[PDB]
């Protein structure tokens, strides 16, 4: 006996969607029959267990459709944007709808209609749709010219519900008001599932092409292979940083490319445990090559197919592999799928999963640059114009420039989080004010950017305290030298590809203590912005064993995400203070993994590193290697011009004009004060200031005798020396 | 492979030379062998003891090293280990020096690569005798820093000038002083002499 | 056409225009599997002459050597770079003998519990023993036999090791069989 | 309801005589039932992962007969050989063997049969074996007026889809030719396990003596200490470079000596579970009580039981030692089991 099942699957009506056909759905039979549907009633055809469209029920054929199979006219699945793949639910119809009196059609190309066609052509679809819903799209509507075609929906209806995905109507012809509309979307309260395309996750072009040719090659021209014979790459692994697009990529290629999906795999699975998932998986890839031509998405390949570290295994990497090895049939015969993966980190896959005939393909998204961030934020506010008022062009560069660092998926949690302070200011200026005057200005989103950190900052951790080259007095030349040596070979790589030039690969800060390593690191790590990534010797090590490398290894993947770059490495001495020259036991590791890496990254390909010891003989010799780090800069004790910037910086809230305070004679006393220390001569002037009188006005002469007496130096048996030594 | 690791100590000289023999002649080299193994006769005592025995027990025993010859670089040749300075390991013992005049002229022709300064701007065959104490590898050094101060002018395309060359000159003091001079002359005396 | 990787022609006497070509493979357009013979294998004329010294040796005339009381050299390994013509020359070394191959398979031929891998082993090798002559091939074979002495290897890689322990040693001195290992 | 053992231990008849019973393996009624193995019908006996030896089931007492135990002939264990202990598989065969026509016939001390025995003797114990196979060795066979005992072996047997290791065939008296020979082995076609022997051991000699004294007087003789007020020597410990035939002894002591032989072979007894490596231990050193008497070997001792001391020992290596030496010498008692270890 015929058993009727519980969930159905979408294919596409053959034949072309016109006539009465286009509200209709060919169901089997049997199902028909065994849900008591008569064929040529009305039933609601839906996603299973949402809201669905109502369409005509027909008897299809058993040899055309098996038990599970529906085809809807793409009129139908239009209005739900239903992609051949989406499994149904079947529902009969207890009310018939009413009838229509007025109906708003447009185009989804926007042309104007009633400079293209006649209404005898609404007529004819409208009356081919029987139950109007609103929604529906006519597609490719050709001109009286021949050469132009036209889209065409029901923007919307009205006659003077359950379950109903928009309110349907009847059309009959002669008592139905047609109207034409310039809107390329039914009405917006009708809130529909509205498609997803291209227009919103732009931002990524180059990558994007690269999936429409890894979609190209695998669904248009699998014959075009049969002939050059070779393997074909018929497996993709779409990486990239956590909340970059990746997702919605493979939304887009979903919706936007017309191959059958087969289900999302997804970390779920019936019991997620071996033997018992084995079958339940194999099913969905045994689902591929009987449909034409597909597209099996396997987002999360991380948490499907974990890296297997030391012990950690069901069987289902080995079933992956073992079932992928079929799934890559194809182009003699059965060649109509593809398999895309998603990840936000590759190397936690099984590697096996990558090698030829598997995911032997990759797209590889990365970190928005600051015109990718201007198109994020253009293509991401296009979706208000009445509530904004403030993007003209101008000011949004301006957010781009200040929204270094994030993602794609901070910048749409700036945009809601800038709503909802918008929201809350506007009803905290009074207690209460017209919803529809609010409107997001410069000022909300400007505020916003203080609460809204980047995602980034929870897996990249970065201190980058914001100094500026003003904040640095002095260092003129070393401001000169790292414009010259890191800025330029950074931001210019595509020039010195042009003029040949060599980028200093390995910038190495040496000096005494207190002088502005660090500081000029942080300042060119913040003004004239760049990534900028640092590790800590105390951090890479773990208690563990190998936990130091795979950190090592790990630090280097993350820093892969961007360009122009500069790793910066601080006290770089210690990470390799021995276990190369002395004590070679078994723990440099660490080194070897650093010294291994500092040789991978290409010389020009737009990331630099920096580093910085005040103790540069204890660097192994390893890394001062030409090509490795060989470029040294000396950032010496401040001369007179420069202690005197830092004193006026410092003292500035002091009135040491009104005071008399001389700096020109701080300054010339100061000799030989390293940095950190002319800043310390003036709070200990500050602290001899508020003790003598809390409540203090000034500071005044006395109160820099007092804090002069009592600082001490530097050792000049180890500054001048032991780096004069270094620098030969 | 002078590095303290299981396969390094004394393994992969051995690996190397068993590729090299084993290949058709070869003219194995050895950059800086004076800096690789050091003295260690109470001046500069490195800790490897190991290398310098790997190459002692490859160079000299039975094998058969038919087509092979032992090249090796030095510019602190007192430091090598004087097992090898004796005949056994190393027996020809020859001096390179930096580029005289024409070979400076040639040397600056083959720094520019993509520069078009004597059409416009300065003749490269003007800057022949110019560069004077520039090692091969320093004349490069003058031609980058020009190279990096022409990306300071346009930024964006042009030639160099001569001033950039100058700069060159300050900013990269005499390379080949007399220090070195006499450093060799007084080693070469004894590499020379039978002393 | 469907479910048939070519569609013959019942051919018959008459009609067939019989036109002879100078092409070296079936039509292009199914695509039939191509055979992977020696002649895709370039690169390595010395090493894959070792291999097949080392395969016919044991494979065709073990008789002669088994007259000596000490058993053939039925094991061989592969070893080297995890990219060169490793599981591709088990591949050739397959399709050019017409010995029977097997295949242990490295996750598939265990099952669960006891008295499973045991049994697959001991089907596999007496199979190989029936049918003559035989190639045992074990791609991989680090994935079931590592040292013992980490802590990947647990109750299952024993269990693997033993019975091939058991097994290879005590065939021999008549059955045409090889086994050849390869391992990264 | 029931549960049928996975694996099956190896065990000797009470009776150590000839008889219809030879060729019997007495398997518990449950287990008969399990399998559907109907008594008096054909049933294959190997180790795991080897092939089978043809063995025709009786039924043991219910009461007294364990689970896991099969009792073996000598003569059946001698074509596999099969030593106590070993872990057995159980399978039916829905198979009738073939029938002889001329089966072939020695003896390991190589004299002649018809002058040491009457031929009538030979078809006696073939005809009531019920099943002839190459590789059955029929011990202490008494010569002539006993002058002395011979041990006889089915060298080869002939006929002019299971998977066996020896070739069933059935004893038909007269037409099946008794055929001597002087081969003291069997055929070397098949491919039979040939037990190894102290005549294979070069060297050791004293240190095989020593070997024969502490593993003779504590298992087969230990009323002498009990009359002397001594305890038996239970242990020896074998130590010297690798290389040096530890391993050969423990097998050949394994092979020759009639005990029930069990094996730590070091890791394989280990788990990631916090008490199984000692429960491993314990149902070891219980199943040698059980069973007497018992040889627990325990190759690379070193490997299970480190110093306990060192820094690497933690507190799973002390667990281990102590479930060692508690099993050894502790509140409980040892038995007639004798512990042989070897290390480097
Ligand atoms: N043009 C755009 N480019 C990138 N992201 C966008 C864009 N417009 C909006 N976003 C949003 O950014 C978010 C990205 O989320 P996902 O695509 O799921 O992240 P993802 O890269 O897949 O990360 P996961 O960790 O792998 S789920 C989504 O909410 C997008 O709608
Ligand atoms: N204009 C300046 N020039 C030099 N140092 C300054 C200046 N202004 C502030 N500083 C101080 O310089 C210090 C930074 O000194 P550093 O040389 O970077 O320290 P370091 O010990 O040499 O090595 P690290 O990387 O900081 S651990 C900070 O404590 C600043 O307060
Ligand atoms: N001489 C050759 N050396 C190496 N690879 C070759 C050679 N000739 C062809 N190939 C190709 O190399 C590809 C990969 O070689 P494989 O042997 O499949 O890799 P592999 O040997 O399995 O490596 P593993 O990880 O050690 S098992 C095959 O698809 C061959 O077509
Ligand atoms: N007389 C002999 N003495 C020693 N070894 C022999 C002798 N005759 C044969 N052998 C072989 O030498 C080996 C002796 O066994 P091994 O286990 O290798 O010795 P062992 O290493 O001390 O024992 P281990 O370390 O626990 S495996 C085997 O491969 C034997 O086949």
Same mark, same amino acid.
């Given at each position: 006996?015929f058993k009727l099942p519980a969930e159905f699957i979408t294919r596409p009506h053959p034949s072309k969607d016109h006539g009465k056909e286009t509200c209709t759905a060919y169901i089997h039979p049997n199902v028909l029959s065994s849900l008591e549907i008569n064929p040529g009633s009305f039933c609601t055809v839906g996603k299973i267990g949402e809201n669905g469209i109502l369409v005509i029920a027909r008897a299809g054929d058993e040899e055309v459709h098996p038990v599970n199979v529906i085809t809807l006219s793409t009129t139908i699945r239009s209005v739900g944007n239903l992609i051949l793949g989406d499994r149904l639910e079947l529902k009969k119809a207890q009310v018939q709808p009413p009838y229509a009196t007025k109906v708003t059609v447009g185009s989804l190309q926007?042309?104007?209609i009633?400079?293209?066609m006649?209404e005898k052509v609404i007529q004819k679809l409208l009356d081919d749709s029987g139950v109007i819903m609103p929604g529906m799209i006519f597609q490719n509507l050709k ?6 075609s036209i889209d065409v929906v029901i923007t919307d209806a009205s006659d003077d519900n359950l379950f109903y995905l928009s309110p349907p109507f009847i059309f009959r012809k002669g008592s139905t008001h047609i109207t034409?509309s310039?809107e390329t979307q039914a009405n917006r309260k009708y809130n529909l599932p509205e498609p997803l395309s ?53 939304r887009?290629?979903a919706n936007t490319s017309n191959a059958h999906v087969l289900t999302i ?22 689902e591929?090559?009987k449909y034409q031509?597909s ?434 | ?47 490897? !003891? ?6 002692? !027990? ?25 097992? +090898? ?22 040397? +600056? ?32 050094? +003058? ?53």
């Open positions: 006996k926007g042309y104007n009633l400079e293209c006649e001109t009286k010219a021949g050469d132009e034409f310039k291209y227009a919103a996750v732009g931002g990524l072009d180059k990558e994007i092409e690269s999936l429409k040719s890894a979609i190209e090659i695998p669904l248009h021209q699998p014959t075009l292979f049969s002939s050059f014979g070779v393997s074909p790459p018929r497996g993709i692994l779409l990486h990239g940083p956590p909340g970059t697009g990746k997702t919605m990529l493979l887009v290629v795999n997804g970390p779920s699975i019936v019991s997620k445990y071996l033997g018992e998932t084995e079958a339940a998986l194999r099913d969905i890839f045994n591929a090559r031509p597209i099996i998405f396997i987002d999360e390949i991380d948490s499907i197919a974990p890296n297997r570290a030391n012990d950690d295994s069901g069987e289902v990497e080995s079933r992956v592999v073992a079932t992928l090895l079929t799934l890559m049939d194809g182009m003699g015969a059965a060649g109509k799928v593809v398999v895309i993966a998603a990840t936000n980190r590759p190397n936690s896959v099984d590697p096996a999963l990558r090698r030829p005939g598997r995911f032997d393909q990759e797209v590889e998204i990365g970190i928005p640059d600051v015109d990718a961030r201007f198109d994020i934020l253009t293509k991401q506010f296009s979706r208000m114009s009445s509530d904004r008022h403030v993007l003209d062009s101008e000011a949004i560069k301006y957010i781009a420039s200040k929204t270094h660092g994030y993602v794609g998926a901070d910048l749409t949690a700036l945009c809601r989080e800038s709503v909802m302070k918008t929201i809350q200011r506007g009803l905290g200026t009074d207690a209460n004010i017209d919803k529809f005057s609010l409107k997001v200005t410069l000022k909300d989103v400007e505020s916003a950017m203080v609460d809204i950190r980047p995602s980034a900052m929870r897996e990249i951790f970065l201190e980058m305290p914001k100094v500026y080259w003003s904040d640095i007095g002095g260092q003129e030349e070393l401001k000169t030298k790292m414009k010259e040596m890191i800025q330029l070979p950074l931001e210019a790589s595509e020039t010195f590809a042009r003029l040949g030039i060599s980028a200093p690969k390995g910038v190495l800060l040496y000096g005494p203590p207190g002088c502005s390593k660090t500081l000029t690191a942080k300042a060119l790590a913040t003004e004239s912005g760049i990534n900028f990534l640092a590790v800590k010797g105390p951090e890479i090590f773990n208690k563990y064993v190998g936990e130091s490398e795979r950190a090592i290894r790990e630090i280097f993947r993350k820093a892969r995400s961007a360009a122009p770059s500069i790793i910066f490495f601080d006290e770089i001495d210690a990470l390799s203070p021995d276990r190369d020259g002395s004590s070679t036991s078994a723990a440099n590791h660490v080194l070897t993994s650093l010294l291994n890496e500092i040789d991978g990254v290409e010389e020009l390909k737009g990331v630099v590193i920096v580093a910085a010891t005040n103790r540069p003989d204890e660097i192994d010799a390893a890394l001062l290697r030409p090509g490795r780090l060989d470029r040294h800069i000396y950032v010496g004790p401040p001369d007179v011009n420069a202690r005197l910037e830092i004193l006026k910086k410092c003292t500035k809230k002091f009135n040491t004009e009104e005071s008399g305070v001389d700096l020109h004679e701080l300054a010339d006393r100061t000799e030989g004060y390293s940095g950190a220390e002319v800043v310390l001569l003036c709070q200990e002037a500050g602290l001899a200031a508020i003790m003598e009188d809390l409540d203090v006005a000034k500071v005044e002469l006395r109160h820099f005798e007092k804090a002069f007496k009592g600082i001490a130096r530097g050792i000049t048996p180890e500054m001048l020396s032991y780096y004069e030594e270094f620098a030969l | 492979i002078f590095n303290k690791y299981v396969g390094e100590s004394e393994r992969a000289i051995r690996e190397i030379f068993r590729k090299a023999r084993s290949a058709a002649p070869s003219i194995i080299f050895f950059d800086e062998i004076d800096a690789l193994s050091p003295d260690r006769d109470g001046s500069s005592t490195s800790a490897a !003891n190991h290398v310098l025995t790997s190459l002692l !027990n490859e160079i000299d025993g039975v094998e058969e090293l038919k087509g092979v010859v032992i090249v090796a670089a030095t510019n602190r040749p007192d430091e090598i280990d004087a097992a +090898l300075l004796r005949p056994g390991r190393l027996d020809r013992h020859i001096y390179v020096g930096p580029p005289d005049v024409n070979a400076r002229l040639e040397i +600056l022709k083959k720094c520019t690569k993509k520069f078009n300064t004597e059409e416009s701007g300065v003749d490269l065959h003007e800057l022949a005798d110019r560069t004077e104490g520039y090692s091969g590898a320093e004349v490069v050094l +003058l031609c980058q820093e020009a190279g990096l101060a022409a990306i300071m002018e346009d930024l964006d395309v042009a030639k160099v000038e001569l001033r950039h060359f100058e700069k060159a000159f300050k900013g990269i003091a005499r390379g080949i002083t007399p220090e070195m001079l006499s450093y060799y002359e007084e080693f070469a005396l004894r590499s020379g002499s039978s002393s």
